[PDB]
Amino acid sequence: TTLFLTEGDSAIGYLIDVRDKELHGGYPLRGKVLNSWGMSYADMLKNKELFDICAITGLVLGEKAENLNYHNIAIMTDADHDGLGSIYPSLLGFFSNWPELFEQGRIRFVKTPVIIAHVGKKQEWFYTVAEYESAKDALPKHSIRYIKGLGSLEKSEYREMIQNPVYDVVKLPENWKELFEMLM
Amino acid sequence: DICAITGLVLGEKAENLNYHNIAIMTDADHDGLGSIYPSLLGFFSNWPELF
Amino acid sequence: SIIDNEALAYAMYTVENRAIPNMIDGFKPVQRFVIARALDLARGNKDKFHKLASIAGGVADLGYHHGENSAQDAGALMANTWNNNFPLLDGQGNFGSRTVQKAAASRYIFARVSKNFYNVYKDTEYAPVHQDKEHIPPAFYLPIIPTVLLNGVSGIATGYATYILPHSVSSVKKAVLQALQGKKVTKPKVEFPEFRGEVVEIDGQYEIRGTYKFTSRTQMHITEIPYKYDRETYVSKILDPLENKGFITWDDACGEHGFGFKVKFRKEYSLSDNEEERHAKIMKDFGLIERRSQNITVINEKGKLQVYDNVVDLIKDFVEVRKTYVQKRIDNKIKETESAFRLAFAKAHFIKKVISGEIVVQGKTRKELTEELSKIDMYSSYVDKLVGMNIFHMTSDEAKKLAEEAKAKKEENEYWKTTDVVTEYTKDLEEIK
Amino acid sequence: SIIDNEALAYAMYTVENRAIPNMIDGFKPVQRFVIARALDLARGNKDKFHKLASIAGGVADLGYHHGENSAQDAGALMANTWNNNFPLLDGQGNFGSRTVQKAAASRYIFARVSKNFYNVYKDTEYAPVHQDKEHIPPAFYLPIIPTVLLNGVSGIATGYATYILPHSVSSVKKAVLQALQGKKVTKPKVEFPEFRGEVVEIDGQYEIRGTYKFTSRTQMHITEIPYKYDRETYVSKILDPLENKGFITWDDACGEHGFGFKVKFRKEYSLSDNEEERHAKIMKDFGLIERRSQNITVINEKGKLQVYDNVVDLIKDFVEVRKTYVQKRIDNKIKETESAFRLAFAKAHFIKKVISGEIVVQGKTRKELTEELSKIDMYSSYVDKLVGMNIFHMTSDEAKKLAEEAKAKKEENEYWKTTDVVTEYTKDLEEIK
């Protein structure tokens, strides 16, 4: 099973209209979270949404990475600016409290696209701007649509992007203290 | 801030007035017509000698 | 006597700024502005999801003398296929949900005109403009089946309050198609969108009930609640006052469509038997039954207001205005097609005289050809269109093709000549789907 | 032996997206892409006001391997004449001031392309295409007066920095107009915008100063402050360091042109006399004398960066680019106008043949006159264009006067044939004012 740590009531509305009840889960986030490592572990316990995802996954702070109600944790954001640098450093900093989640690689990313053209009956799926550059030499009927946001896809694209995701991994270099001190 | 700038202290007459005239202009679609004009008029109606 | 200059100004704040809709288009005053802004952007790319800021900041020159925040959230609230039955205006974004009836933002959300709207709102461009000069939308748009019956409208004005209820698409289609024939008017049936409970009458008034299912001795699956209950206001208004007595408890197991609320009883409750007082305690405690009231008050084709007790006379008045406003289109198409028939006949006759070349054509310098064609009895009236002639049509194949077009125009002119209101309106009523 | 494939990829970061402009156009690559988006939002109507986000959000398929914010605030910063002299782009709104060098919004201000750009950027389309496919802007736009000397570039790159200061437009006009003539090149004078102070040479380096104006025994009115600080960094770096010592005080009375700050003397200070040591204490204390550095480090038409001690060689390399880059247009227009007069003789002779009408056209099928147009030596290269002939040709007014515009393009044909590059570039230099 998996848990989607997606954003807002919109994406969980589409997720309720899309997901499998047995396999795929979900949870939104209430709002803006601050810098992750400026706050004590009892103050991550004072924070509300972090305690919510400590209780839903069953991995509360101060314990070994076991008895997890969700074997997978996925986070599903908007690919313009809404979660590309806002949800992810704070969420990866909070998930850095258990390095055994990262050793098993239990946090993934589902890439919503950037550009979609509607060609024929089946629209195309440029995931990034680099694939949009590299495959503009052979792509017909260039009617452009921007996917700057989770709302910019309908229920059908949300359906084939949950039921057929890509599950991009999270970052893990040889040191897990040198790269998270960049933002401060 | 504006009662310190105008010199009309709260609870006294309009004396030692730094500015003789008070004028308001805003974006006149809805930014200042029905939003900040009645609030500023509720400020300035507490001194009816200004009216 | 100038204080009435204030008060009549109140009468352009309590007549033309009213929330009362119209019987004909089924539209609010702000809905015509957001529709006109969306179609002003539709043009060729009627499929490019235009930004809700561009709609919302675009209604300034359409004549809406209020805030852009109102249309900015109005377009969010009326682009929902789950709040309303008939899809009028589509889009990509959040437009509300039965979990939470809000949008996620208004700045990552883009809206679109639907092709079903143009399947259902013909004679939009024929619509007469409002008495006020600044109103760039017309006075009322023109549907095939009305938007008063479909999807519902609710609001409260000064002294009058509309609560018009959504109805099912096939029954509104059958109602307009059957009251067009002048029979006993079928009142449309009501189908709330994504509602698997039961909608039935009690006494003149509708009730809505969802679905509650006994699953054990002390367990419940409310598969559906009635329509005006979301998750958390129903939890905090009813289910949490039931929780604080220690009576029941809830599980969050909401389904694919509708709800999935599983409720487990506790032992400090009634838990009565015999299947008439336990169900009484259920729809008095869980609130499985919800009632309402009806008052069909709606502004007519002019600025006055009229009240109906039923939608039968509403459908009758809609189709009796629709009869004349299709008849006007019939007369306009007839007067277009007769002059277009005489013109196409003139051009086919002149392409016969071109591919013959029986007109002297060379050496007619200083336009002596059209000084010869200014005295022909019909060629004169459109000399400026008989002269746009290349050499490319001198071969006879295009002459015979324009003669085939002329014969095709004749039967076409006979088809739109002999026709009337009823068959074209019922062909539109057939081809809305 | 693969790690260099990252490092040359690092060279991919440090060749095409540097902050150093090229020496012909004077254009940064980000400025090339925002110019291309400004004309892309101009297209037909140049005068139409483009939206800043619509400028900035559309650069992504224009060649920029970065985000929209760098072009977004680049367009904000070079839109204003309080910082620069030559307006590359006009706009509706404010983009800064000399008192406050901050723009209004990244999402409110309008933009359009100025007419003087077209008065100085002709022949920006005959440049050869780039190696990279994304660079649909040319590698250098071709001016009559370059932007390296027009306006200023204050940029830091990988080991290279530019602080190329603005110059006065009549002096660069004389400099390019005289370096066209091939004598000793006049050095352009430096005139910062809205400046009535003194920029003077001391030894190889231009120092700047404003004007400070004594008005009484213990007061001044500062006319100008140097161009390193606008208001609050100026106060935090200068006026509050000398104000917090108790020496002197200031008051804000900033006027229209320049600055207007009024300075009141307190009693503990030097208060010196003789107008040598008091002025030296002013330029030591108020910071009127400011020193800069100059180095013309600019990439040429190839990938090598050229370092110039003085802009005379910059103007010489600019004009040695421009002479051949307009002799390309000379050869292109010569090859255009020879076949243009050949088609002119085709149309004039064929229309005198048509108004003669010795060729018979009536009853002629299968474009049979093309069977007598194909065996002409001269009409046969234009057959489709010469059967594209409407009736208005047949009037002899537009036969004979169209023949006399064939003679008018004959005299223009000999006008482009007799002219050479230096006198049309003299027309370019003389008709900018």
Describe this structure in words.
- The relative contact order of chain A is 0.17.
- Chain A is of the alpha/beta class.
- Chain A has 7 helices and 6 strands, in the order βαααβααββαβαβ.
- Chain A is globular.
- In chain A, the strands form 2 sheets. A 4-stranded mixed β-sheet of chain A has the order 1-2-3-6, with no helix packed on it. A two-stranded antiparallel ribbon of chain A has the order 4-5.
- Chain C has about 425 residues and is α+β, with helices and mostly antiparallel strands.
- Chain C has 13 helices and 14 strands.
- Chain C has helices at about 5-10, 30-40, 50-55, 70-75, 115-120, 170-180, 230-245, 280-285, 310-355, 370, 385, 395-420, 420-430, and strands at about 50, 90, 110-115, 155, 160-165, 200, 205-210, 210-215, 220-225, 250, 260-265, 290, 295-300, 305-310.
- In chain C, the strands form 5 sheets. A 4-stranded antiparallel β-sheet of chain C has the order 8-9-11-10, with helices on one face. A 3-stranded antiparallel β-sheet of chain C has the order 1-3-2.
- In chain C, helix 2 crosses helix 4 (about 70-75), helix 9 packs antiparallel against helix 12 (about 395-420) and helix 9 (about 310-355) crosses helix 13 (about 420-430).
- Chain C is elongated, with a radius of gyration of 30 Å.
- Chains in contact: A-C, A-D, B-C, C-D.
- The interface of C and D includes residues 359 and 389 of C.
Would you spell out the secondary-structure blueprint of this structure?
This is part of a larger assembly, with two copies of chain A and two copies of chain C (433 residues).
Chain A: E1 2-4, H1 8-16, H2 41-46, H3 48-56, E2 72-75, H4 87-95, H5 99-103, E3 107-109, E4 115-117, H6 129-134, E5 144-146, H7 155-162, E6 168-169
Parallel strand pairs in A: 1-2, 2-3
Antiparallel strand pairs in A: 3-6, 4-5
Chain C: H1 4-10, H2 29-42, E1 50-51, H3 52-56, H4 68-77, E2 89-92, E3 110-113, H5 115-120, E4 153-156, E5 161-164, H6 169-179, E6 198-201, E7 206-209, E8 211-214, E9 219-224, H7 232-243, E10 248-251, E11 261-265, H8 278-285, E12 289-290, E13 296-299, E14 305-308, H9 312-356, H10 368-372, H11 383-386, H12 396-418, H13 421-430
Helix pairs in contact in C: 2-4, 9-12, 9-13
Protein name (chain B): DNA topoisomerase (ATP-hydrolyzing)
Family (chain B): Belongs to the type II topoisomerase family.
Binding site for Mg(2+) 2 (chain B): 27, 29
